[PDB]
Design a protein around this ligand. Structure first.
Ligand code: HEM
Ligand code: HEM
Ligand SMILES: Cc1cc(CCNCc2ccc3c(C)cc(N)nc3c2)ccc1C#N
Ligand SMILES: Cc1cc(CCNCc2ccc3c(C)cc(N)nc3c2)ccc1C#N
Ligand SMILES: C[C@H](O)[C@H](O)[C@H]1CNc2nc(N)[nH]c(=O)c2N1
Ligand SMILES: C[C@H](O)[C@H](O)[C@H]1CNc2nc(N)[nH]c(=O)c2N1
Ligand SMILES: [Zn+2]
Lengths: 409, 416
C-alpha cells in the first residue's frame, strides 16, 4: 500500500510509493524495530537477476526501456556471466551506479547534491602504487583549494574474494591515535588500532596529537603498502573563536576533506570493496562528535574550564554551553579560511527541500531519522519533526568487515 | 526467529543480550522491508469477544502469579477458573486490587518511549472503579493532583476509572493533560496562549467555559462518565502548582513573563490490562527540563520564544552559522531548571535522567532479559550525543500491559 509521512511542524504530508520497489531487508520485523542498531541482521545464477534488475533500472532512467540497445545489453551481460562468471559495467552505467548509491543512502543528510558527483574510474588499477596515484588525484580534485567538490574513485570489483582491493584507512585523511604509558591517549582514540598497524609496518610516527596517518593500500589481495600523502594536498584548518581570544590556545585543528574509504559499493550484483568517496563537512561532525565524544578528543571539560563555568552539578548545563561555543568556533574557522562547510540548520533545511523533490519526482526518499537528526539542537531543526520511512534500495553503500580480520599476510 | 538478540553501547562497548522480546505481543508497524521507527502513531466502537478474551486474560494471570512466585499454585488455578467462569457468563471480568496495581506498574515498565522508568516500581495507584458520575471523576482527579503535587515534592500516581464494557458507556477525560494552558486563535491570525490546545479550548468555550483570554490560563476539566455528555469543572487554583521562570544571570529574563506548571499528567491514553480497556486512566510523574525548555517553549508551533530571547541576549541573528538559536536554547533551559530547583519543585535534567535510564536498562536486561526502548523518543531534543543514550543501541517492541493511544473523544462521542 501507499504510505503517508507527515511533518508535525508544518503538517505537510507526502505519499511514499518508492518503498514498494525495495528488495533488501532492513533488519526490523513485525514484532521488533531495530532502527537504532548500527549494523543490523555471489554465484553466476545469483548474479544474473541482480544484473538484470540494475540494467532494467538503468534503461528505465534514460527512457529507453525495452529498446534495441536495452535488449542487446541484456544479451551481452548474460553471455558474459556464463563465459566469465562475472561481467563489466559500461562507463555510463558506472556513473549512474555511483550517483544512485548516494541517492539511496538513507543516512546521508547531504543527498540534495547527489547528481553533482565526480566519478573517477580506476578499474584498470593493478597495484598499490597505482592506487596511491588515483587517490592523490582524487584528493587534489576534491579539495580544490578549499572549494570542495564531491568525488568517488572506484577500483576493480571483487572477483574470487582473494584478489580484493581495499583502502585499509577508514578515511583517506585521519589523525593518529597513540596509547600512552599513562593508559591515556594522544591524538584520536578512534584510530589507536590502525595507528599501531601502521607503526608495525614501518611508519615512524611523530607521536603528536594531529598527525596525519599514512595510506595503507591493498591491491589485488596482496599485503598492504604504506604511502605518504603529499602534505601540500592535505588542507587543514586551525580552529579559533570569533569572541574568545583564548580559544587559539587550545591548539585545535581539523582537516578540510571528509573522505570515507572503508565502505563497499554494490552495483548490479558487483562488489567494489575499494571506492573512497568524499564531500564536505557538516560542522557538527567535527565540533560535536570528533571533538566532544568521550571516546574521541573529549575537549568539553577543558573548554568549559577556560570559560570559567561552574562544573560541579550537571543541571547548570555547562556541557551544553561549552558545546555550542566549540561548534561556533569550527564554523567561524572554516568560513574564515574559505574552506567549504555547512551548518546543521542549513543542511537539515536543504534535506527537507530534497525530500519534497524526491517525493515529487521519484515517489519517495529512504531516510534514517536516527542518523539524519543532528547530534545537537535536534528539535530546533526541521528534520526532528519530519516523519521518515527507511528502506533499502540498490545500488548502495554497504559496510564490510575490517581488512585485518580477514587478511593472511 | 532467534532466541537471543545483542545490543551494543558504542561509547563503552558494553554488550547486552535480549531474550524478553520473545514475549512481544502486537505489531510495531515495521516489516522486514521497511522501518517505521520515526512514525508517530503507526495505526469502531466495538469490543473484545469471549474467545478473544480468555487467552488475553489467561496470559496476564499466568504472568501475575509467576511474578509473585506462585505459578502453578492452587491459588493460581483457582484464579484461572474464576476468571474463565466470569468471562463465560458475563462476557467480561474484574481485576482484583492486587492485579490492577500489578498491571498499572507494568504498563509503565513496558512503556518504550518513557525515559523515567527507573521509578516504575514506586507508583501510587488510585482505584476509581466505583465511580459513576462526572462529579465523582472530578473528585477523584482533585485528590490525585493534590497527592501527586505534594507541595512540590512530586510523587508519581495513576487514577483508574471503570473499564470499557460495550463501548457506549466509556469513561473519558477529554483533556489531553489534567493541567494545560489555553490557546485562542485571533481574527488577526495570531495565537494567544499555547497553540497546541486551540482545538480543545474551542470545545470548552462551546461547552460553556468563560475564558480569561490570557497567555497562561489553566483549562477546565472536561469529564465524561459512563457514556454521557461531558461536563465542565474548574480545578481549584490552589491545587495547581506553578513556577515563574527566571535566570540565574540575566535579570531581564523574568521580564519575558514566563511560567509553567509543575505537574505533567496525561489523561487521554488508554491502559490495557489482561485484555481489559481502561479508557480513562490519568497518570502523572514529574518533568524533565527539556520538555518545557525545548519543546513547550521553543517549538515553532508552540510558545516559540527563541527569537525574543535571542534579541534580549543581543545575539547576531543575520546568519544561522552564528548558532544564535543554539545559544538561546541552552540559556532558556538553564532558566527553567534554575527556577524549578529554587521553588523546590521536583525536576530532572536530561543528563541525570538519561544516565539513570542507562542504569535502569542494564538492570532490566540482567533481571528480566530485556527492556523495550524507543531511541527516537528516549534521546533528548537538545544535546543528544553528549548524553549516554545517544550511543546506546535499543530494541523496540510492545509488551502488555501497555499504555496505548486512542481517538479523541469528540470525534467519536454520540451526543445524548
Ligand atoms: C556533499 C556534502 C555531504 C554532506 C554535507 C554529507 C553529510 C553527511 C553526514 C552528516 C553524515 C552522517 C555522518 C556521521 O555522523 O557519521 C553522512 C553520512 C553518509 N554519507 Fe553523506 N555527506 C555529503 C556527501 C556525500 C557523498 C559525496 C556521498 C557518496 C557519494 C555520501 C554518502 C554517505 C553515506 C553512505 C553515509 C552513511 C555512512 C555510514 O552509514 O557509515 N555523502 N553524510
Ligand atoms: C516520574 C518521572 C517521569 C519522567 C521523568 C518521565 C519522562 C518522560 C518523558 C521525558 C517522556 C517523553 C514525552 C514527550 O517528549 O512528550 C515520557 C513519555 C512517556 N511516559 Fe514517562 N516520565 C515519568 C513518569 C511516568 C509515569 C508515572 C508513567 C506511567 C505510569 C509514564 C509513562 C509514560 C508514557 C506512557 C510515555 C509515552 C507518551 C506518549 O507516547 O505520548 N511516565 N516520559
Ligand atoms: C562502524 C562505524 C561507522 C561509522 C561511519 C561514520 N561515517 C562518517 C562519515 C561518512 C561519510 C561522510 C561524507 C561522505 C561526508 C561528510 N560530510 N561526512 C561524512 C561522515 C561511524 C562510527 C562507527 C562506529 N563504531
Ligand atoms: C500526538 C502527540 C502526542 C503527544 C503526547 C506527549 N506526551 C508527553 C508526556 C507524557 C507523559 C509524561 C509523563 C508521565 C511524565 C513526564 N515528565 N512527561 C510526560 C510527557 C505529544 C505530541 C503529539 C503530537 N503531535
Ligand atoms: C546507537 C546509535 O545507532 C548510534 O549511536 C548512532 C546514532 N545516530 C547517529 N547519527 C549520526 N549522524 N552518526 C552516528 O554515528 C550515529 N550513531
Ligand atoms: C517525527 C518524530 O517521530 C517526532 O517528531 C518525534 C521525534 N521524537 C520525539 N521524542 C519525544 N520525547 N517527544 C516527541 O514528541 C518526539 N517527537
Ligand atoms: Zn523499525
Amino acid at each position: 500500500r501507499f504510505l503517508k509521512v507527515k511533518n508535525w511542524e508544518t503538517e505537510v504530508v507526502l505519499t511514499d510509493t518508492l518503498h514498494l520497489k525495495s528488495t533488501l531487508e532492513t533488519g526490523c520485523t513485525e514484532y521488533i524495530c531495530m532502527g537504532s542498531i548500527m549494523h543490523p541482521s555471489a554465484t553466476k545464477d545469483q548474479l544474473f537477476p541482480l544484473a538484470k534488475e540494475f540494467i532494467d533500472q538503468y534503461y528505465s532512467s534514460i527512457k529507453r526501456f525495452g529498446s534495441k540497445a536495452h535488449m542487446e545489453r541484456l544479451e551481452e551481460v548474460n553471455k558474459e556471466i556464463d563465459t566469465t562468471s562475472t561481467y563489466q559495467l559500461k562507463d555510463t552505467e558506472l556513473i549512474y551506479g555511483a550517483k544512485h548509491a548516494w541517492r539511496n543512502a538513507s543516512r546521508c543528510v547531504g543527498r540534495i547534491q547527489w547528481s553533482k558527483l565526480q566519478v573517477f574510474d580506476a578499474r584498470d588499477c593493478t597495484t598499490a602504487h597505482g592506487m596511491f596515484n588515483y587517490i592523490c588525484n582524487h584528493v587534489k580534485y576534491a579539495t580544490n583549494k578549499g572549494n570542495l567538490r564531491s568525488a568517488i574513485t572506484i577500483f576493480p570489483q571483487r572477483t574470487d574474494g582473494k584478489h580484493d582491493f581495499r583502502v585499509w584507512n577508514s578515511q583517506l585523511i585521519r589523525y593518529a591515535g597513540y596509547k600512552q604509558p599513562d593508559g591515556s591517549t594522544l591524538g584520536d582514540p578512534a584510530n589507536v588500532q590502525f595507528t599501531e598497524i601502521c607503526i608495525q609496518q614501518g611508519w615512524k610516527p611523530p607521536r603528536g596529537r594531529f598527525d596525519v596517518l599514512p595510506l595503507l593500500l591493498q591491491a589485488n589481495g596482496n599485503d598492504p603498502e604504506l604511502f605518504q600523502i603529499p602534505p601540500e594536498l592535505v588542507l587543514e584548518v586551525p580552529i579559533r573563536h570569533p569572541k574568545f581570544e583564548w580559544f587559539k590556545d587550545l591548539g585545535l585543528k581539523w582537516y578540510g576533506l571528509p573522505a570515507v574509504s572503508n565502505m563497499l559499493l554494490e552495483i548490479g550484483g558487483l562488489e567494489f570493496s575499494a571506492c573512497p568517496f568524499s564531500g564536505w563537512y557538516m560542522g557538527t561532525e567535527i565540533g560535536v562528535r570528533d571533538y566532544c565524544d568521550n571516546s574521541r578528543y573529549n575537549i568539553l571539560e577543558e573548554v568549559a574550564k577556560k570559560m570559567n563555568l561552574d562544573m560541579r552539578k550537571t543541571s547548570s548545563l555547562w556541557k551544553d554551553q561549552a558545546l555550542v561555543e566549540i561548534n561556533i568556533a569550527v564554523l567561524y574557522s572554516f568560513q574564515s579560511d574559505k574552506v567549504t562547510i555547512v551548518d546543521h540548520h542549513s543542511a537539515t533545511e536543504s534535506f527537507i527541500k530534497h525530500m519534497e523533490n524526491e517525493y515529487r519526482c521519484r515517489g519517495g526518499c529512504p531516510a534514517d531519522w536516527v542518523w539524519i537528526v543532528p547530534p545537537m539542537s535536534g528539535s530546533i531543526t526541521p528534520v526532528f519533526h519530519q516523519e521518515m520511512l527507511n528502506y533499502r534500495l540498490t545500488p548502495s553503500f554497504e559496510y564490510q568487515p575490517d581488512p585485518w580480520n580477514t587478511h593472511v599476510w
